[PDB]
Amino acid sequence: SYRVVAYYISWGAYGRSYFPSDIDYSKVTHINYAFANIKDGEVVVGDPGVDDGGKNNFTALRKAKKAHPHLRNLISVGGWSWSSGFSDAAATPEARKRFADSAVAFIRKYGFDGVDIDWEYPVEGGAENMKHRPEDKQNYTLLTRSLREALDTAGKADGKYYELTTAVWGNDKFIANTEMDKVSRDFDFINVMSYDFNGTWNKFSGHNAPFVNDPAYDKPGIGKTFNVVSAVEAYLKAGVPADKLVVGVPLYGYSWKGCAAGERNGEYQDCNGKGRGTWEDGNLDFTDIEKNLLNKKGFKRYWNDTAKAAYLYNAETGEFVTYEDPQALKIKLDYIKSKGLGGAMYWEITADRKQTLVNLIADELLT
């Protein structure tokens, strides 16, 4: 009944030394490969050093498909850094056909089973380099339609079914800026990025993925919809069918340093910038939290029983960590089942080497 959609990051094949051969494919239904880029209106190889050459991640994913007939591998196009080409690609029938034909050509040449559209984000939002136009709201629908038609035609030619999915913002601005009731019919499933609700863009601490609204969290401009249940309910109301709605989970955490304790052990407090990270300041792999911080080395675990979220606080350094604890993740997996949702998605599989969260998701949703 349930999907388990794991993002694999191409750059895992650098210093992380986590290759597709390292994935336990028994723990997933789908791998989304992050990412393909857009160049001159076409889907292109994101990183020739690790994708179709060099470390040859694509070869490794095709090997995995042969070893695991259940497995479906999708190419994720865009993401935070590489979304700047979508607005142009979507804007005219000619641009949409050029884009869609390039997506089909890509999955045929590299052995993928479909396309995940990670457009961050239509109309407004995204990276400093991001490009938008008001017409994105309707053009997201039209680009999706062009892709679905091209993939239908190619699948009939190829004797295969090709999937078409999307990653959608946890922020309900995305719903205001799209037609989820019109476009849902062309996506096999919709990966809700029900995380990144709080982070070091705020000078104060908070939870990356609180389950429900905590009214005790009353910092400027951060309202009552920045939580998993609000995001799920918003997409259902917008016309995403429950069975297509896949709930995103983070396998990373965010950290701040120099957070005041207040009377909440550092929670919702003013801080002094990013805390320690794994591969960059302020961003921790679950592996690192689990090995080095979780009730370890002056970091103490606390549980917010309103938000249903765990955090770590080091009173000596004022470092605050938001991360996905098994206690929170079990609540989310029960919620998926209760609401008849499409399963779970996670960013990203390299960040949990002991498969603590990976195994809980697989145990609860697969059988």
PDB file of all heavy atoms in Angstrom, residues 20-57:
ATOM      1  N   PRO A  20      25.760   4.586  -4.718  1.00  0.00           N
ATOM      2  CA  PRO A  20      24.536   3.789  -4.824  1.00  0.00           C
ATOM      3  C   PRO A  20      24.718   2.333  -4.359  1.00  0.00           C
ATOM      4  O   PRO A  20      23.773   1.736  -3.864  1.00  0.00           O
ATOM      5  CB  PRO A  20      24.182   3.903  -6.311  1.00  0.00           C
ATOM      6  CG  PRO A  20      24.737   5.267  -6.692  1.00  0.00           C
ATOM      7  CD  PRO A  20      26.067   5.334  -5.959  1.00  0.00           C
ATOM      8  N   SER A  21      25.923   1.786  -4.494  1.00  0.00           N
ATOM      9  CA  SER A  21      26.198   0.398  -4.011  1.00  0.00           C
ATOM     10  C   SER A  21      25.965   0.287  -2.492  1.00  0.00           C
ATOM     11  O   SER A  21      25.783  -0.835  -2.005  1.00  0.00           O
ATOM     12  CB  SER A  21      27.574  -0.046  -4.390  1.00  0.00           C
ATOM     13  OG  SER A  21      28.558   0.732  -3.746  1.00  0.00           O
ATOM     14  N   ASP A  22      26.024   1.402  -1.767  1.00  0.00           N
ATOM     15  CA  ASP A  22      25.868   1.430  -0.284  1.00  0.00           C
ATOM     16  C   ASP A  22      24.394   1.394   0.125  1.00  0.00           C
ATOM     17  O   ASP A  22      24.114   1.112   1.297  1.00  0.00           O
ATOM     18  CB  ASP A  22      26.566   2.648   0.306  1.00  0.00           C
ATOM     19  CG  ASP A  22      28.076   2.548   0.207  1.00  0.00           C
ATOM     20  OD1 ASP A  22      28.607   1.523   0.677  1.00  0.00           O
ATOM     21  OD2 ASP A  22      28.705   3.473  -0.352  1.00  0.00           O
ATOM     22  N   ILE A  23      23.486   1.673  -0.802  1.00  0.00           N
ATOM     23  CA  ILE A  23      22.026   1.698  -0.474  1.00  0.00           C
ATOM     24  C   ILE A  23      21.536   0.276  -0.187  1.00  0.00           C
ATOM     25  O   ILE A  23      21.881  -0.647  -0.944  1.00  0.00           O
ATOM     26  CB  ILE A  23      21.227   2.360  -1.609  1.00  0.00           C
ATOM     27  CG1 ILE A  23      21.642   3.822  -1.792  1.00  0.00           C
ATOM     28  CG2 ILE A  23      19.731   2.205  -1.371  1.00  0.00           C
ATOM     29  CD1 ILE A  23      21.018   4.497  -2.991  1.00  0.00           C
ATOM     30  N   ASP A  24      20.723   0.132   0.857  1.00  0.00           N
ATOM     31  CA  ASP A  24      19.958  -1.128   1.070  1.00  0.00           C
ATOM     32  C   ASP A  24      18.621  -0.976   0.341  1.00  0.00           C
ATOM     33  O   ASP A  24      17.668  -0.400   0.908  1.00  0.00           O
ATOM     34  CB  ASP A  24      19.790  -1.490   2.541  1.00  0.00           C
ATOM     35  CG  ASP A  24      19.131  -2.840   2.761  1.00  0.00           C
ATOM     36  OD1 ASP A  24      18.525  -3.370   1.803  1.00  0.00           O
ATOM     37  OD2 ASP A  24      19.232  -3.352   3.884  1.00  0.00           O
ATOM     38  N   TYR A  25      18.561  -1.484  -0.883  1.00  0.00           N
ATOM     39  CA  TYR A  25      17.383  -1.273  -1.772  1.00  0.00           C
ATOM     40  C   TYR A  25      16.147  -1.996  -1.233  1.00  0.00           C
ATOM     41  O   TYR A  25      15.036  -1.664  -1.680  1.00  0.00           O
ATOM     42  CB  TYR A  25      17.688  -1.668  -3.211  1.00  0.00           C
ATOM     43  CG  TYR A  25      18.703  -0.749  -3.838  1.00  0.00           C
ATOM     44  CD1 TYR A  25      20.055  -1.048  -3.831  1.00  0.00           C
ATOM     45  CD2 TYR A  25      18.324   0.474  -4.357  1.00  0.00           C
ATOM     46  CE1 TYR A  25      20.992  -0.187  -4.376  1.00  0.00           C
ATOM     47  CE2 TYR A  25      19.244   1.350  -4.907  1.00  0.00           C
ATOM     48  CZ  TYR A  25      20.583   1.018  -4.915  1.00  0.00           C
ATOM     49  OH  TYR A  25      21.513   1.854  -5.454  1.00  0.00           O
ATOM     50  N   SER A  26      16.325  -2.943  -0.313  1.00  0.00           N
ATOM     51  CA  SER A  26      15.166  -3.621   0.344  1.00  0.00           C
ATOM     52  C   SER A  26      14.373  -2.624   1.202  1.00  0.00           C
ATOM     53  O   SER A  26      13.219  -2.924   1.555  1.00  0.00           O
ATOM     54  CB  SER A  26      15.572  -4.838   1.140  1.00  0.00           C
ATOM     55  OG  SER A  26      16.201  -4.477   2.360  1.00  0.00           O
ATOM     56  N   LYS A  27      14.976  -1.484   1.530  1.00  0.00           N
ATOM     57  CA  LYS A  27      14.356  -0.515   2.485  1.00  0.00           C
ATOM     58  C   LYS A  27      13.541   0.557   1.756  1.00  0.00           C
ATOM     59  O   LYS A  27      12.971   1.406   2.441  1.00  0.00           O
ATOM     60  CB  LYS A  27      15.438   0.146   3.337  1.00  0.00           C
ATOM     61  CG  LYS A  27      16.368  -0.823   4.051  1.00  0.00           C
ATOM     62  CD  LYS A  27      15.704  -1.640   5.137  1.00  0.00           C
ATOM     63  CE  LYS A  27      16.606  -2.688   5.763  1.00  0.00           C
ATOM     64  NZ  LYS A  27      17.879  -2.130   6.284  1.00  0.00           N
ATOM     65  N   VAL A  28      13.459   0.486   0.432  1.00  0.00           N
ATOM     66  CA  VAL A  28      12.810   1.574  -0.366  1.00  0.00           C
ATOM     67  C   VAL A  28      11.898   0.967  -1.424  1.00  0.00           C
ATOM     68  O   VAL A  28      12.074  -0.200  -1.792  1.00  0.00           O
ATOM     69  CB  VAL A  28      13.840   2.512  -1.020  1.00  0.00           C
ATOM     70  CG1 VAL A  28      14.833   3.057  -0.009  1.00  0.00           C
ATOM     71  CG2 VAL A  28      14.541   1.862  -2.200  1.00  0.00           C
ATOM     72  N   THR A  29      10.984   1.785  -1.923  1.00  0.00           N
ATOM     73  CA  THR A  29      10.270   1.469  -3.196  1.00  0.00           C
ATOM     74  C   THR A  29      10.893   2.257  -4.350  1.00  0.00           C
ATOM     75  O   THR A  29      10.930   1.743  -5.478  1.00  0.00           O
ATOM     76  CB  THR A  29       8.760   1.694  -3.107  1.00  0.00           C
ATOM     77  OG1 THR A  29       8.520   3.070  -2.825  1.00  0.00           O
ATOM     78  CG2 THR A  29       8.110   0.825  -2.059  1.00  0.00           C
ATOM     79  N   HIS A  30      11.365   3.460  -4.055  1.00  0.00           N
ATOM     80  CA  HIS A  30      11.863   4.407  -5.083  1.00  0.00           C
ATOM     81  C   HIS A  30      13.145   5.083  -4.628  1.00  0.00           C
ATOM     82  O   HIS A  30      13.250   5.433  -3.446  1.00  0.00           O
ATOM     83  CB  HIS A  30      10.837   5.503  -5.378  1.00  0.00           C
ATOM     84  CG  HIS A  30       9.579   5.018  -5.999  1.00  0.00           C
ATOM     85  ND1 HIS A  30       8.596   4.371  -5.276  1.00  0.00           N
ATOM     86  CD2 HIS A  30       9.121   5.137  -7.262  1.00  0.00           C
ATOM     87  CE1 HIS A  30       7.600   4.073  -6.082  1.00  0.00           C
ATOM     88  NE2 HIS A  30       7.893   4.545  -7.300  1.00  0.00           N
ATOM     89  N   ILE A  31      14.062   5.260  -5.569  1.00  0.00           N
ATOM     90  CA  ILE A  31      15.201   6.202  -5.374  1.00  0.00           C
ATOM     91  C   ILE A  31      14.960   7.389  -6.291  1.00  0.00           C
ATOM     92  O   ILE A  31      14.760   7.179  -7.501  1.00  0.00           O
ATOM     93  CB  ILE A  31      16.565   5.549  -5.666  1.00  0.00           C
ATOM     94  CG1 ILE A  31      16.861   4.380  -4.723  1.00  0.00           C
ATOM     95  CG2 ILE A  31      17.683   6.588  -5.648  1.00  0.00           C
ATOM     96  CD1 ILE A  31      16.948   4.746  -3.273  1.00  0.00           C
ATOM     97  N   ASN A  32      15.010   8.588  -5.715  1.00  0.00           N
ATOM     98  CA  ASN A  32      15.053   9.845  -6.499  1.00  0.00           C
ATOM     99  C   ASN A  32      16.501  10.306  -6.548  1.00  0.00           C
ATOM    100  O   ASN A  32      17.096  10.562  -5.483  1.00  0.00           O
ATOM    101  CB  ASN A  32      14.167  10.933  -5.905  1.00  0.00           C
ATOM    102  CG  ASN A  32      12.681  10.709  -6.074  1.00  0.00           C
ATOM    103  OD1 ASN A  32      12.236   9.838  -6.821  1.00  0.00           O
ATOM    104  ND2 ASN A  32      11.905  11.533  -5.387  1.00  0.00           N
ATOM    105  N   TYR A  33      17.040  10.432  -7.754  1.00  0.00           N
ATOM    106  CA  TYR A  33      18.448  10.865  -7.931  1.00  0.00           C
ATOM    107  C   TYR A  33      18.518  12.383  -8.003  1.00  0.00           C
ATOM    108  O   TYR A  33      18.022  12.981  -8.961  1.00  0.00           O
ATOM    109  CB  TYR A  33      19.061  10.258  -9.178  1.00  0.00           C
ATOM    110  CG  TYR A  33      20.555  10.432  -9.264  1.00  0.00           C
ATOM    111  CD1 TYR A  33      21.386   9.465  -8.733  1.00  0.00           C
ATOM    112  CD2 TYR A  33      21.120  11.559  -9.847  1.00  0.00           C
ATOM    113  CE1 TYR A  33      22.759   9.586  -8.810  1.00  0.00           C
ATOM    114  CE2 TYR A  33      22.494  11.703  -9.923  1.00  0.00           C
ATOM    115  CZ  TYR A  33      23.305  10.696  -9.420  1.00  0.00           C
ATOM    116  OH  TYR A  33      24.658  10.753  -9.491  1.00  0.00           O
ATOM    117  N   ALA A  34      19.145  12.964  -6.987  1.00  0.00           N
ATOM    118  CA  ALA A  34      19.316  14.436  -6.889  1.00  0.00           C
ATOM    119  C   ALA A  34      20.708  14.800  -7.396  1.00  0.00           C
ATOM    120  O   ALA A  34      21.687  14.433  -6.760  1.00  0.00           O
ATOM    121  CB  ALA A  34      19.121  14.878  -5.466  1.00  0.00           C
ATOM    122  N   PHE A  35      20.847  15.491  -8.532  1.00  0.00           N
ATOM    123  CA  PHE A  35      19.810  16.068  -9.376  1.00  0.00           C
ATOM    124  C   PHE A  35      20.291  16.081 -10.826  1.00  0.00           C
ATOM    125  O   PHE A  35      21.511  16.005 -11.076  1.00  0.00           O
ATOM    126  CB  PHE A  35      19.536  17.533  -9.010  1.00  0.00           C
ATOM    127  CG  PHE A  35      18.854  17.763  -7.688  1.00  0.00           C
ATOM    128  CD1 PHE A  35      19.523  18.372  -6.635  1.00  0.00           C
ATOM    129  CD2 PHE A  35      17.518  17.436  -7.526  1.00  0.00           C
ATOM    130  CE1 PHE A  35      18.868  18.606  -5.435  1.00  0.00           C
ATOM    131  CE2 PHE A  35      16.871  17.665  -6.324  1.00  0.00           C
ATOM    132  CZ  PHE A  35      17.546  18.258  -5.286  1.00  0.00           C
ATOM    133  N   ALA A  36      19.346  16.263 -11.742  1.00  0.00           N
ATOM    134  CA  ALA A  36      19.636  16.756 -13.109  1.00  0.00           C
ATOM    135  C   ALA A  36      19.467  18.279 -13.129  1.00  0.00           C
ATOM    136  O   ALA A  36      18.671  18.830 -12.347  1.00  0.00           O
ATOM    137  CB  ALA A  36      18.768  16.094 -14.141  1.00  0.00           C
ATOM    138  N   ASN A  37      20.237  18.935 -13.987  1.00  0.00           N
ATOM    139  CA  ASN A  37      20.171  20.405 -14.169  1.00  0.00           C
ATOM    140  C   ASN A  37      19.308  20.704 -15.400  1.00  0.00           C
ATOM    141  O   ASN A  37      18.853  19.766 -16.096  1.00  0.00           O
ATOM    142  CB  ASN A  37      21.584  20.987 -14.276  1.00  0.00           C
ATOM    143  CG  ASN A  37      21.721  22.429 -13.849  1.00  0.00           C
ATOM    144  OD1 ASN A  37      20.741  23.170 -13.794  1.00  0.00           O
ATOM    145  ND2 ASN A  37      22.949  22.840 -13.593  1.00  0.00           N
ATOM    146  N   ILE A  38      19.110  21.992 -15.658  1.00  0.00           N
ATOM    147  CA  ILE A  38      18.445  22.468 -16.902  1.00  0.00           C
ATOM    148  C   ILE A  38      19.437  23.382 -17.605  1.00  0.00           C
ATOM    149  O   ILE A  38      19.973  24.302 -16.950  1.00  0.00           O
ATOM    150  CB  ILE A  38      17.130  23.204 -16.602  1.00  0.00           C
ATOM    151  CG1 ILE A  38      16.189  22.347 -15.752  1.00  0.00           C
ATOM    152  CG2 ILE A  38      16.473  23.673 -17.898  1.00  0.00           C
ATOM    153  CD1 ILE A  38      14.985  23.086 -15.220  1.00  0.00           C
ATOM    154  N   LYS A  39      19.681  23.119 -18.880  1.00  0.00           N
ATOM    155  CA  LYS A  39      20.546  23.999 -19.717  1.00  0.00           C
ATOM    156  C   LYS A  39      19.847  24.241 -21.054  1.00  0.00           C
ATOM    157  O   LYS A  39      19.448  23.258 -21.687  1.00  0.00           O
ATOM    158  CB  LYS A  39      21.944  23.416 -19.938  1.00  0.00           C
ATOM    159  CG  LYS A  39      22.867  24.328 -20.745  1.00  0.00           C
ATOM    160  CD  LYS A  39      24.284  23.850 -20.900  1.00  0.00           C
ATOM    161  CE  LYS A  39      25.081  24.742 -21.833  1.00  0.00           C
ATOM    162  NZ  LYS A  39      26.431  24.198 -22.108  1.00  0.00           N
ATOM    163  N   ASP A  40      19.713  25.507 -21.429  1.00  0.00           N
ATOM    164  CA  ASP A  40      19.046  25.874 -22.710  1.00  0.00           C
ATOM    165  C   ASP A  40      17.731  25.093 -22.827  1.00  0.00           C
ATOM    166  O   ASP A  40      17.455  24.511 -23.900  1.00  0.00           O
ATOM    167  CB  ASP A  40      19.989  25.633 -23.888  1.00  0.00           C
ATOM    168  CG  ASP A  40      21.264  26.453 -23.810  1.00  0.00           C
ATOM    169  OD1 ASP A  40      21.195  27.592 -23.317  1.00  0.00           O
ATOM    170  OD2 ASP A  40      22.315  25.939 -24.224  1.00  0.00           O
ATOM    171  N   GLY A  41      16.954  25.081 -21.744  1.00  0.00           N
ATOM    172  CA  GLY A  41      15.577  24.537 -21.777  1.00  0.00           C
ATOM    173  C   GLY A  41      15.497  23.021 -21.803  1.00  0.00           C
ATOM    174  O   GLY A  41      14.389  22.502 -21.999  1.00  0.00           O
ATOM    175  N   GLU A  42      16.613  22.327 -21.567  1.00  0.00           N
ATOM    176  CA  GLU A  42      16.651  20.839 -21.598  1.00  0.00           C
ATOM    177  C   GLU A  42      17.177  20.298 -20.278  1.00  0.00           C
ATOM    178  O   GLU A  42      18.088  20.875 -19.673  1.00  0.00           O
ATOM    179  CB  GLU A  42      17.505  20.332 -22.756  1.00  0.00           C
ATOM    180  CG  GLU A  42      16.973  20.754 -24.116  1.00  0.00           C
ATOM    181  CD  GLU A  42      17.759  20.206 -25.294  1.00  0.00           C
ATOM    182  OE1 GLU A  42      18.998  20.324 -25.264  1.00  0.00           O
ATOM    183  OE2 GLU A  42      17.134  19.654 -26.224  1.00  0.00           O
ATOM    184  N   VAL A  43      16.643  19.146 -19.907  1.00  0.00           N
ATOM    185  CA  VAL A  43      17.201  18.333 -18.791  1.00  0.00           C
ATOM    186  C   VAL A  43      18.597  17.865 -19.208  1.00  0.00           C
ATOM    187  O   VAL A  43      18.731  17.257 -20.282  1.00  0.00           O
ATOM    188  CB  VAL A  43      16.284  17.147 -18.466  1.00  0.00           C
ATOM    189  CG1 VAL A  43      16.862  16.294 -17.351  1.00  0.00           C
ATOM    190  CG2 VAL A  43      14.880  17.603 -18.112  1.00  0.00           C
ATOM    191  N   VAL A  44      19.590  18.127 -18.367  1.00  0.00           N
ATOM    192  CA  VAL A  44      21.002  17.732 -18.657  1.00  0.00           C
ATOM    193  C   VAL A  44      21.613  17.053 -17.433  1.00  0.00           C
ATOM    194  O   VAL A  44      21.177  17.275 -16.291  1.00  0.00           O
ATOM    195  CB  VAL A  44      21.859  18.920 -19.136  1.00  0.00           C
ATOM    196  CG1 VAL A  44      21.330  19.518 -20.431  1.00  0.00           C
ATOM    197  CG2 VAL A  44      21.993  19.986 -18.059  1.00  0.00           C
ATOM    198  N   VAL A  45      22.654  16.287 -17.696  1.00  0.00           N
ATOM    199  CA  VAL A  45      23.438  15.665 -16.597  1.00  0.00           C
ATOM    200  C   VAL A  45      23.916  16.758 -15.633  1.00  0.00           C
ATOM    201  O   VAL A  45      24.521  17.759 -16.084  1.00  0.00           O
ATOM    202  CB  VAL A  45      24.602  14.849 -17.166  1.00  0.00           C
ATOM    203  CG1 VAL A  45      25.571  14.428 -16.066  1.00  0.00           C
ATOM    204  CG2 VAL A  45      24.094  13.631 -17.912  1.00  0.00           C
ATOM    205  N   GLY A  46      23.659  16.555 -14.341  1.00  0.00           N
ATOM    206  CA  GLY A  46      24.011  17.562 -13.314  1.00  0.00           C
ATOM    207  C   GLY A  46      25.504  17.623 -13.065  1.00  0.00           C
ATOM    208  O   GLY A  46      26.051  18.732 -12.901  1.00  0.00           O
ATOM    209  N   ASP A  47      26.140  16.456 -13.008  1.00  0.00           N
ATOM    210  CA  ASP A  47      27.556  16.380 -12.572  1.00  0.00           C
ATOM    211  C   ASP A  47      28.232  15.232 -13.300  1.00  0.00           C
ATOM    212  O   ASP A  47      28.189  14.083 -12.858  1.00  0.00           O
ATOM    213  CB  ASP A  47      27.658  16.237 -11.058  1.00  0.00           C
ATOM    214  CG  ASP A  47      29.089  16.325 -10.581  1.00  0.00           C
ATOM    215  OD1 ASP A  47      29.993  16.288 -11.441  1.00  0.00           O
ATOM    216  OD2 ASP A  47      29.286  16.395  -9.363  1.00  0.00           O
ATOM    217  N   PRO A  48      28.908  15.519 -14.428  1.00  0.00           N
ATOM    218  CA  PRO A  48      29.623  14.481 -15.173  1.00  0.00           C
ATOM    219  C   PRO A  48      30.725  13.738 -14.405  1.00  0.00           C
ATOM    220  O   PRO A  48      31.146  12.691 -14.869  1.00  0.00           O
ATOM    221  CB  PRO A  48      30.237  15.272 -16.347  1.00  0.00           C
ATOM    222  CG  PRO A  48      29.317  16.464 -16.524  1.00  0.00           C
ATOM    223  CD  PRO A  48      28.925  16.831 -15.106  1.00  0.00           C
ATOM    224  N   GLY A  49      31.188  14.297 -13.286  1.00  0.00           N
ATOM    225  CA  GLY A  49      32.234  13.645 -12.461  1.00  0.00           C
ATOM    226  C   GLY A  49      31.721  12.445 -11.690  1.00  0.00           C
ATOM    227  O   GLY A  49      32.552  11.612 -11.263  1.00  0.00           O
ATOM    228  N   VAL A  50      30.408  12.369 -11.473  1.00  0.00           N
ATOM    229  CA  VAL A  50      29.829  11.251 -10.659  1.00  0.00           C
ATOM    230  C   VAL A  50      28.577  10.638 -11.287  1.00  0.00           C
ATOM    231  O   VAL A  50      28.202   9.544 -10.834  1.00  0.00           O
ATOM    232  CB  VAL A  50      29.539  11.681  -9.213  1.00  0.00           C
ATOM    233  CG1 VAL A  50      30.829  11.968  -8.475  1.00  0.00           C
ATOM    234  CG2 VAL A  50      28.592  12.865  -9.155  1.00  0.00           C
ATOM    235  N   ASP A  51      27.958  11.270 -12.282  1.00  0.00           N
ATOM    236  CA  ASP A  51      26.632  10.801 -12.771  1.00  0.00           C
ATOM    237  C   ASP A  51      26.834   9.744 -13.864  1.00  0.00           C
ATOM    238  O   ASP A  51      26.731   8.518 -13.571  1.00  0.00           O
ATOM    239  CB  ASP A  51      25.802  11.991 -13.239  1.00  0.00           C
ATOM    240  CG  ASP A  51      25.363  12.950 -12.152  1.00  0.00           C
ATOM    241  OD1 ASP A  51      25.581  12.677 -10.950  1.00  0.00           O
ATOM    242  OD2 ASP A  51      24.799  13.987 -12.537  1.00  0.00           O
ATOM    243  N   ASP A  52      27.174  10.211 -15.066  1.00  0.00           N
ATOM    244  CA  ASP A  52      27.301   9.355 -16.278  1.00  0.00           C
ATOM    245  C   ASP A  52      28.777   9.079 -16.574  1.00  0.00           C
ATOM    246  O   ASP A  52      29.072   8.505 -17.630  1.00  0.00           O
ATOM    247  CB  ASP A  52      26.647  10.002 -17.493  1.00  0.00           C
ATOM    248  CG  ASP A  52      27.274  11.315 -17.923  1.00  0.00           C
ATOM    249  OD1 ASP A  52      27.860  11.987 -17.070  1.00  0.00           O
ATOM    250  OD2 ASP A  52      27.167  11.648 -19.116  1.00  0.00           O
ATOM    251  N   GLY A  53      29.659   9.485 -15.669  1.00  0.00           N
ATOM    252  CA  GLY A  53      31.112   9.286 -15.824  1.00  0.00           C
ATOM    253  C   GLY A  53      31.776   9.309 -14.470  1.00  0.00           C
ATOM    254  O   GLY A  53      31.064   9.442 -13.455  1.00  0.00           O
ATOM    255  N   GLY A  54      33.098   9.186 -14.459  1.00  0.00           N
ATOM    256  CA  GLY A  54      33.870   9.264 -13.202  1.00  0.00           C
ATOM    257  C   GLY A  54      33.473   8.160 -12.236  1.00  0.00           C
ATOM    258  O   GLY A  54      33.760   6.987 -12.518  1.00  0.00           O
ATOM    259  N   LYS A  55      32.812   8.503 -11.132  1.00  0.00           N
ATOM    260  CA  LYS A  55      32.347   7.466 -10.158  1.00  0.00           C
ATOM    261  C   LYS A  55      31.152   6.678 -10.720  1.00  0.00           C
ATOM    262  O   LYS A  55      30.848   5.611 -10.180  1.00  0.00           O
ATOM    263  CB  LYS A  55      32.025   8.092  -8.801  1.00  0.00           C
ATOM    264  CG  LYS A  55      33.182   8.826  -8.129  1.00  0.00           C
ATOM    265  CD  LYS A  55      34.508   8.103  -8.115  1.00  0.00           C
ATOM    266  CE  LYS A  55      34.544   6.917  -7.181  1.00  0.00           C
ATOM    267  NZ  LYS A  55      35.921   6.398  -7.054  1.00  0.00           N
ATOM    268  N   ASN A  56      30.517   7.154 -11.787  1.00  0.00           N
ATOM    269  CA  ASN A  56      29.524   6.329 -12.541  1.00  0.00           C
ATOM    270  C   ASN A  56      28.387   5.869 -11.615  1.00  0.00           C
ATOM    271  O   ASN A  56      28.022   4.691 -11.593  1.00  0.00           O
ATOM    272  CB  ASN A  56      30.211   5.178 -13.276  1.00  0.00           C
ATOM    273  CG  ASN A  56      30.808   5.647 -14.587  1.00  0.00           C
ATOM    274  OD1 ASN A  56      30.112   6.257 -15.400  1.00  0.00           O
ATOM    275  ND2 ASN A  56      32.091   5.400 -14.790  1.00  0.00           N
ATOM    276  N   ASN A  57      27.779   6.808 -10.914  1.00  0.00           N
ATOM    277  CA  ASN A  57      26.586   6.494 -10.084  1.00  0.00           C
ATOM    278  C   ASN A  57      25.467   5.906 -10.948  1.00  0.00           C
ATOM    279  O   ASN A  57      24.736   5.041 -10.446  1.00  0.00           O
ATOM    280  CB  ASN A  57      26.053   7.726  -9.363  1.00  0.00           C
ATOM    281  CG  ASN A  57      26.940   8.213  -8.240  1.00  0.00           C
ATOM    282  OD1 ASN A  57      27.804   7.500  -7.739  1.00  0.00           O
ATOM    283  ND2 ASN A  57      26.703   9.440  -7.816  1.00  0.00           N
TER     284      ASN A  57
END
